[PDB]
């Protein structure tokens, strides 16, 4: 599904601090900044380069 079954995605440290807690449409907005399109349905990319 294209984001309609996920509340949010995050990268928290030690049950301590969310660093990129985003809903699935803002999470994909950081992907379009990177690969200039969207990955297919259900695929979620996280860049830490």
């Amino acid at each position: 599904n294209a984001g309609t079954d996920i509340n949010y995605l995050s990268q928290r440290t030690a049950n301590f601090s969310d660093t990129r807690k985003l809903d699935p449409k803002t999470w994909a907005a950081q992907t379009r900044r990177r690969i200039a399109t969207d990955f297919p349905k259900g695929v979620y990319y996280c860049d830490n380069r």
Binding site: T13, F16, S17, T19
Partner: protein, 84 residues
């Protein structure tokens, strides 16, 4: 490093219309005084710890004691009367 043509030479530059001489001169831009605003906090609730970590875990020990050592009823050997 051009070569002078002796058959068709030319002279130096003649005056041409100009670009209104004050409009090529800029103003010197006038800085006012500034301030890094606000009263800064002394510390920050950081999302990561600032100390070292350990790559591997090492097994630790603590000493224990055994107990009160008792006597025993041994099975005792036979007498060496030249059979042994």
């Amino acid at each position: 490093m051009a070569l002078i043509n002796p058959q068709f030479p030319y002279a130096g530059p003649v005056p041409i219309p100009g670009p209104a001489p004050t409009e090529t001169m800029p103003l010197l831009n006038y800085r006012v005084e500034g301030r890094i605003a606000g009263i800064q906090q002394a510390r920050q609730f950081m999302p990561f710890l600032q100390g070292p970590h350990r790559e591997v875990a090492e097994q630790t020990y603590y000493a224990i004691g055994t107990g009160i050592q008792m006597g025993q009823t041994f099975n005792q050997p036979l007498i060496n009367t030249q059979e042994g």
